[PDB]
Amino acid sequence: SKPFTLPILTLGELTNSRFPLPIDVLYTNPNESAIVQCQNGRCTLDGELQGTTQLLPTGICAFRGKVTQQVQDEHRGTHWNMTVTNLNGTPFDPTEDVPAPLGTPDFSGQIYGVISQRNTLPANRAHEAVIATYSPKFTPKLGNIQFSTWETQDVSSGQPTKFTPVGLASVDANSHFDQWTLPSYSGALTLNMNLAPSVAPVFPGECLLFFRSFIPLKGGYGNPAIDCLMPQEWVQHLYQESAPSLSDVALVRYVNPETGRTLFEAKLHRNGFLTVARNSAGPVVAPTNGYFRFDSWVNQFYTLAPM
Amino acid sequence: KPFTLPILTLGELTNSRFPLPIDVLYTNPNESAIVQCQNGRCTLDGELQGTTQLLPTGICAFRGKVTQQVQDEHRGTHWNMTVTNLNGTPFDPTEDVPAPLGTPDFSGQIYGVISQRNTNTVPGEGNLPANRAHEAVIATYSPKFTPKLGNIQFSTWETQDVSSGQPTKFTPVGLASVDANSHFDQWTLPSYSGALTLNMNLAPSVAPVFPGECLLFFRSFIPLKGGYGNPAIDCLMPQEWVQHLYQESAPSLSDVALVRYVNPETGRTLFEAKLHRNGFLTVARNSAGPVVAPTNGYFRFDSWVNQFYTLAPM
Ligand SMILES: C[C@@H]1O[C@@H](O[C@H]2[C@H](O[C@H]3[C@H](O)[C@@H](O)[C@@H](O)O[C@@H]3CO)O[C@H](CO)[C@H](O)[C@@H]2O)[C@@H](O)[C@H](O)[C@@H]1O
């Protein structure tokens, strides 16, 4: 049986699997009221990608496709309908057993980025753009979405189009940012399908442990963050290794390699998420050289040393 | 410890010199420039070189602080920003690196977004900081591009809404232009400490040694803000190879690893290549252009070979 391993990467060598951001801090929030069911950064410990998760760091919250036409919308700006393909350019098959094209954003909000086009030497253009994932026009599972520009005219129809995500447009009330609210991938009155399962601690005194990144803002007030269950490099590692899971729960230790000492231990669950025994919210303050190391397979009854 | 490569198709790889997916494998035997890029540089036993670092988000990115608006003759509004290491710690110019890790390694007008999140918070706004972001261009050929000195200059279309003394991030997106006046040349290094200074601590140049061999690149097409063109960025190894080699640190048993590009469906070898100790590929090919290969293809380590080994022609 191929031994289970995690990569040896400090926090400063990890990136977020739900938005293209470095990992800033480890983070807990025991009093979280929302169901945690993100769809990017989802991978079982034996290497099965789930939800909308794919391997490319450049694919996370990215889109590829073609503008069909300018469209009208209640949102501020100029609006454009875009058909979307798979990120590799092949047509998206809405009957595939996935919630949405892989890489599709997995949260409610106004995602800010840049739309660029290279015509079929070719002419080019790029503009700032916003994709409102809560919008009735956000229907990636049907093969098309809508973005808005401040630019009023220079977006070409029928030309290859890329969305590069950068951050959020706003986190004010009207912008509906909620990292745990899933988009309706096929539109408002339709049920999402093929979702990666929700995650939660089962043991008393335990809470989820997140890899947190702070996400840029185009304007307004706020310090928004995106929490992922595992960094993108862990997704990539687990997929490569495909090591069989010998129980439902791996014990892992966060180690200081300089001193060799364990800072804390955590449960790494089969479906691909961490829990710790902690009763507070906020960052985990840990030396920069720290990283998780697999210790042993345990079970759901194992009692974690309190953080 | 046995040497290995990850098992990743082209469609599962990203560029180590700009945040782009890999589009095609590519050769250009008649290239006249010295190939000495500084990102995507890693020896086969896992030593990062040049300005190479591990984060896909760090490639051609900057972290720092805007000091002030400044004057420049070129069109737009110009701003000076000090730069730190990507992790926020101060950049130490005496470090044995060409420039802060992640610094762009080519001449051009790099287009992206500058964003700011103020240090000070506002009581009337729930003790939250103010934010702004705008499109920006960094001319890496400019005398004001001095990342090794700890500061660079960027231009914006926005004329006023960039704040002094506030934490600033540059997220790269593509190039502003590739017209003659924009000086795009992927093999021309920036002058990291400014005009007329010698770059130091560089990853070495790479080149084939055997007759009939040429470099093999992982090619990505880079977006443009405007104008005509189809610019590409060629890297020696994808970022995932850098990350893998770094992790594994398998000792190199010769100067050259023989690798085979394989079709896993048929099990057949599509072609073979030399993977050199310093971290680059050569093939036996006498043409320039894309390598047309099945989508399911990837490189597999075969064996360490010696100075006399001859590659089968592609
Ligand atoms: C706090 C300031 O944000 C920007 O001010 C611009 C302003 O931003 C608003 C957003 O558009 C809106 O979604 C919400 O977040 O309120 C923000 C203001 O609090 O937008 C107007 C246009 O309507 C102007 O563009 C303002 O410049 C930023 O530009 C400022 O530097 C401040 O950080």
Output DSSP code: residue A141. Answer: G
Q: Ligand 1: distance of its center to the CA of B306 in Å?
A: 63
Residues of B in contact with A233 (CB under 8 A): 243
Q: Length of chain A, please?
A: 307
Question: Which of A149, A169, A189 is the last residue before a domain boundary?
Answer: A169
Smallest CA separation from ligand 1 atom 20, residue: A219
Beta carbon of B7 within 6 Å of any ligand 1 atom: no
Q: Is A248 helix (H, G, I), strand (E, B) or coil?
A: coil
Place of tokens 């290859």: A160
Q: Ligand 1: distance of its center to the CA of B79 in Å?
A: 20
DSSP E strands, A169-239: 206-214, 219-221, 225-228
Rg over CA atoms, chain B: 21
Is B228's CB within 8 Å of A121's CB? Answer: yes
Burial A29-59 (b: 16+ CB within 10 A, else e): beeeeeebbbbbbbbbbbbebbbbbbbbbbb
Q: What is the number of CB-based contacts under 8 A between chain A and chain B?
A: 138
Two tokens, residue A219: 């304007």
Cβ of residue A223 closer than 8 Å to a chain B Cβ: yes
> Backbone dihedral region of B264: left (phi > 0), alpha (psi from -120 to 50 degrees) or beta?
alpha
Q: Quick check: B178 and B85 in contact, CB under 8 A?
A: no
Domain identity same for A162 and A185: no
**How many angstroms separate the CA atoms of A297 and B245, rounded?**
28
Two tokens, residue B302: 């075969």
Residues of A in contact with B167 (CB under 8 A): none
Domain identity same for A176 and A303: yes
Question: Which of A109, A137, A169 is the last residue before a domain boundary?
Answer: A169
For residue A204, give the CATH number of its domain.
2.40.510.10
Domain identity same for B95 and B157: yes
Place of tokens 């993100």: A38
Domain identity same for B77 and B150: yes
Smallest CA separation from ligand 1 atom 24, residue: A219
Question: Which of A141, A169, A197 is the last residue before a domain boundary?
Answer: A169
Closest CA to A144 of A74, A214, A92: A92
Beta carbon of B130 within 6 Å of any ligand 1 atom: yes
**How many angstroms separate the CA atoms of A233 and A231, rounded?**
5
Q: Is B229 helix (H, G, I), strand (E, B) or coil?
A: coil
Domain identity same for A281 and A190: yes
Is B225's CB within 8 Å of A12's CB? Answer: no
Strand partners, A15: A22
Q: Ligand 1: distance of its center to the CA of A217 in Å?
A: 10
Resolution in A: 1.6
* Helix, strand and coil percent figures for chain A, each rounded to 5: 5, 35, 55
Looking at the structure of chain A, the number of domains it has is 2
Domain identity same for A102 and A123: yes
A129 Cβ contact list (under 8 Å, min separation 6): A112, A113, A114, A115, A147, A148, A149, A163
Domain identity same for B53 and B26: yes
Domain identity same for B34 and B7: yes
**How many angstroms separate the CA atoms of A214 and A194, rounded?**
28
The parent domain of residue A195 ranges over 1-59+170-307
Burial A72-96 (b: 16+ CB within 10 A, else e): ebebebbbbbbbbbbbbeeebeeee
Which strand (E) or helix (H) includes residue B274? Answer: strand B269-276
Q: Ligand 1: distance of its center to the CA of B249 in Å?
A: 48
Domain identity same for A215 and A251: yes
Domain identity same for B54 and B98: no
Residue of A nearest to B5 (CA): A240
Beta carbon of B122 within 6 Å of any ligand 1 atom: no
For residue A74, give the CATH number of its domain.
2.40.30.120
How close, in Å, is residue B240 to chain A by CA atoms? 9
Strand partners, B115: B133, B169
Closest CA to A218 of B117, B64, B79, B19: B117
Output DSSP code: residue A197. Answer: P
User: How, if at all, do strands B109-122 and B24-27 pair?
Assistant: unpaired
**How many angstroms separate the CA atoms of B38 and B278, rounded?**
12
Count of Cβ atoms closer than 10 Å to residue A132 Cβ:
23
Domain identity same for A87 and A150: yes
Domain identity same for A158 and A253: no
Q: Quick check: B252 and B270 in contact, CB under 8 A?
A: no
Is A22's CB within 8 Å of B86's CB? Answer: yes
Strand partners, B257: B275, B304
